[PDB]
Amino acid sequence: NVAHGLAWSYYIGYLRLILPELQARIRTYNQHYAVSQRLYILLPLDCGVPDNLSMADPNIRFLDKLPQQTGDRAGIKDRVYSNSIYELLENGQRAGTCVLEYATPLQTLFAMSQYSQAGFSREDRLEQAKLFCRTLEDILADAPESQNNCRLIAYQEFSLSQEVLRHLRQE
Amino acid sequence: NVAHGLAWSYYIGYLRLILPELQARIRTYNQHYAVSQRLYILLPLDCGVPDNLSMADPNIRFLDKLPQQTGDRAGIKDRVYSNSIYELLENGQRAGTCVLEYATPLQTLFAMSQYSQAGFSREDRLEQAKLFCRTLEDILADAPESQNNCRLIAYQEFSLSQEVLRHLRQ
Ligand SMILES: Nc1nc2c(ncn2[C@@H]2O[C@@H]3COP(=O)(O)O[C@H]4[C@@H](O)[C@H](n5cnc6c(=O)[nH]c(N)nc65)O[C@@H]4COP(=O)(O)O[C@H]3[C@H]2O)c(=O)[nH]1
């Protein structure tokens, strides 16, 4: 079972650290340059994770980078954590701005697919994706750092933008 | 068992992406500003991974940051990848300079030992450490990216400085 460890490292190595200081980073960018106060993580269950968000959906267009977050991490002095802000256009009109990004471990699960000495097969990507989404939301349920600082966007394959709009419109 | 997947994550999400551009980054630092041409990966099997190499061994001293590496990954525009270069003093005398860092997954295995939903338990974090290093060693052996662009340093506790210096000498 690979997805279990990837969900935990994703929380132990990233979410536990940037979420407590995310609200302050969004606040700092709003005063200098109306993004919502939440990190939205795309987790396609197909694990079709492209590197460019605009390449996946034309409606999803990059807006600007969040103020970097630094920190000494495992012998790396001032390791920079980067978060990208995106605006979502529907029918040529922007309807929401947010800090949007994919769940990178899913990209890793998709690539681990191809290799020979990977644990899981190439036909178990989907259940691994389903196992990652369940384990992450299980962790973020009992996680004291996730004080409604992020929301999980899980879907199966289409309009990605309006799935994103559905959640931000909720806020 | 979790140590197998995080060795694959360490290789797929980091090493396979930075090792190919490692020597070009060391050469840039060297000409514009005597750093080694390999990335040194400390692998403490105790799993006691501190955030500051400073404090684990005073002789290991942080001097400068390697030139950044950026790239678009998983929807983050130009994601920053940071590497730190250290000086290692031997009896008050600098003996080597290299890009030195810990294996972050080992720090995560230690942290997960505490959490209940994590598969392994406290007693198991040591076996996972050696298991992570083994898996990473097998992956690098068949890794086209690993043109010996990095060296793994496994050590069970003491002078970390010496353990590092032994390898750099060779
Ligand atoms: N959006 C975003 N997400 C982040 C960032 N840093 C970590 N994450 C997420 O958290 C996972 C685990 O991070 P890790 O514990 O540092 O475990 C990392 C770490 O050990 C190594 N690594 C990744 N990036 C860097 C880096 O910039 N510097 C160093 N020294 N190591 C890195 O590779 C492992 C796996 O990397 P990933 O596949 O990327 O998997 C990463 C990624 O999904 C970030 O700056 N931005």
Side-chain angles (χ1 to χ4, degrees), chain A residues 1-26 28-32 34 36 38-54 56-60 62 64-76 78-89 91-121 123-126 128-129 131-155 157-158 160-165 167 169-171, chain B residues 1-22 24-26 28-30 32-60 62-76 78-90 92-120 123-129 131-136 138-164 166-167 169-170:
Chain A
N1 190 15
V2 181
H4 182 265
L6 292 181
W8 267 103
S9 171
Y10 188 54
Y11 161 77
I12 296 305
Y14 180 58
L15 294 179
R16 175 179 71 163
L17 322 192
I18 63 133
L19 284 181
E21 315 189 317
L22 177 78
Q23 197 253 57
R25 292 172 60 203
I26 298 160
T28 304
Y29 178 74
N30 279 332
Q31 59 164 56
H32 261 289
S36 276
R38 244 186 282 259
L39 172 72
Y40 301 87
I41 310 191
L42 297 173
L43 310 104
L45 300 189
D46 48 283
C47 307
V49 180
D51 285 334
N52 186 17
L53 252 176
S54 323
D57 197 323
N59 286 311
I60 309 185
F62 167 82
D64 259 359
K65 311 179 177 170
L66 262 180
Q68 296 178 347
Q69 173 165 354
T70 44
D72 294 357
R73 295 272 303 115
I76 300 284
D78 303 324
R79 177 173 165 178
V80 165
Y81 291 77
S82 299
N83 298 94
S84 288
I85 312 171
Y86 289 82
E87 71 193 287
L88 297 97
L89 297 140
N91 207 344
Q93 290 295 359
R94 74 159 66 204
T97 300
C98 65
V99 173
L100 192 55
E101 73 194 48
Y102 285 96
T104 324
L106 286 187
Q107 204 184 47
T108 301
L109 279 171
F110 192 91
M112 285 178 72
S113 178
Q114 276 194 308
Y115 290 103
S116 147
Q117 273 46 89
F120 57 99
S121 89
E123 65 170 16
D124 284 318
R125 279 201 293 270
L126 179 40
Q128 290 279 308
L131 208 150
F132 184 90
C133 162
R134 285 200 246 193
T135 307
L136 190 56
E137 74 199 7
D138 270 11
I139 295 160
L140 296 177
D142 317 310
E145 300 89 0
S146 155
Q147 302 159 7
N148 285 312
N149 304 98
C150 81
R151 215 78 92 201
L152 293 196
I153 314 297
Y155 47 95
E157 293 180 8
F158 169 64
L160 179 66
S161 316
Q162 310 96 288
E163 312 309 281
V164 172
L165 293 161
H167 290 82
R169 285 166 185 177
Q170 173 63 224
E171 177 181 359
Chain B
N1 166 55
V2 171
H4 177 88
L6 321 193
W8 277 94
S9 160
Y10 195 49
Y11 164 75
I12 292 178
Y14 177 61
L15 281 187
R16 181 177 65 83
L17 307 165
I18 66 103
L19 286 184
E21 318 288 335
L22 184 70
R25 285 170 72 204
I26 304 159
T28 284
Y29 182 80
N30 276 341
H32 263 266
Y33 296 162
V35 195
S36 301
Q37 264 75 15
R38 314 168 85 180
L39 172 83
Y40 290 89
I41 299 170
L42 309 146
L43 282 167
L45 311 95
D46 165 287
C47 303
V49 177
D51 276 330
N52 207 346
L53 257 179
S54 160
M55 175 205 60
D57 198 319
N59 285 323
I60 308 177
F62 175 90
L63 177 63
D64 199 355
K65 313 174 186 177
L66 192 71
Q68 262 165 208
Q69 179 175 336
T70 56
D72 297 348
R73 201 158 63 100
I76 298 271
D78 289 329
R79 174 172 162 179
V80 167
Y81 285 84
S82 293
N83 301 90
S84 309
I85 318 158
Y86 287 80
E87 303 170 329
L88 287 81
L89 291 132
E90 193 167 7
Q93 290 295 298
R94 65 168 65 174
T97 313
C98 56
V99 196
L100 193 55
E101 74 191 48
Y102 281 101
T104 320
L106 284 186
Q107 195 188 48
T108 295
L109 283 171
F110 189 105
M112 300 166 52
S113 147
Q114 313 181 318
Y115 293 71
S116 305
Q117 170 62 23
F120 62 98
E123 42 176 9
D124 304 326
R125 89 164 161 261
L126 179 63
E127 209 62 42
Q128 296 267 316
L131 175 43
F132 172 83
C133 164
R134 181 229 259 180
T135 310
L136 189 59
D138 303 315
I139 296 172
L140 291 176
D142 312 320
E145 298 97 3
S146 156
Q147 326 210 313
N148 215 303
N149 273 114
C150 73
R151 185 56 174 300
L152 311 175
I153 298 185
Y155 59 93
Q156 184 170 355
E157 289 181 307
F158 186 94
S159 69
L160 187 60
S161 95
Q162 285 303 124
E163 221 52 26
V164 171
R166 301 201 320 121
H167 292 247
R169 294 176 190 185
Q170 218 290 358

